[PDB]
């Protein structure tokens, strides 16, 4: 299982996501502890660990710190038109166990045909430790207004 951080060469696949972060740092006073983009693994006879063009599908994790609070954002590569509809917010994550936890999560995502393994999420951070934030309506199909881009951040911080 490849664990190399290919953050910069997959940066183009998270234009919307990377903009959300910028809004959090300026309008919501957030700090980014780390940014890592990892490859999704093949699990069994899985298909969606790849993109339509045969390239690996990736998942980006961003560690954030806001007013003492610390949480992790999970966003899955949707560049080839298969859309995730939500972003995963993880709270109460230990830096000494993240590398291993993430590996388990990636397997879980692919095993559920590109779906959040909510059960696994319960096991790790409890029912109140993880939540899903819906994407701006029609993301990837249209441009999102600056207010809606801020509203996206609002929904994230709301948690």
Swiss-Prot record:
It comes from the Bacteria. TnsABC + TnsD promote high-frequency insertion of Tn7 into a specific target site known as att-Tn7 whereas TnsABC + TnsE promote low-frequency insertion into many different sites. The keyword S-adenosyl-L-methionine does not apply. Keywords: DNA recombination, DNA-binding, Plasmid, Transposable element, Transposition. GO terms for molecular function: DNA binding. The chain holds residues 376 to 534 of 538 of the full protein. The keyword Lipoprotein does not apply. One of its GO terms (biological process) is transposition. This is Transposon Tn7 transposition protein TnsE.
């Amino acid at each position: 299982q490849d664990a190399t951080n290919y953050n910069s060469i997959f940066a183009n696949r998270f234009a919307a996501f990377d903009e959300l972060l910028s809004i959090l740092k300026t309008k919501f006073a957030c700090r980014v502890l780390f940014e890592e983009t990892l490859v999704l693994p093949k699990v069994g006879r899985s298909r969606l660990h790849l993109c339509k063009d045969g390239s690996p599908r990736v998942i980006k994790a961003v560690g954030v710190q806001r007013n003492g609070s610390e949480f992790v954002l999970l966003e899955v590569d949707a560049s080839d038109g298969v859309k995730m509809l939500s972003t995963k917010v993880l709270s109460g994550v230990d830096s000494e166990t993240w590398r291993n936890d993430f590996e388990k999560i990636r397997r879980g995502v692919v095993k559920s045909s590109l779906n959040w393994p909510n059960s696994l999420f319960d096991q790790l951070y409890g029912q109140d430790g993880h939540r899903g934030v819906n994407h701006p309506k029609g993301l990837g199909e249209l441009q999102v207004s600056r207010e809606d881009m801020e509203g996206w951040a609002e929904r994230v911080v709301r948690e």
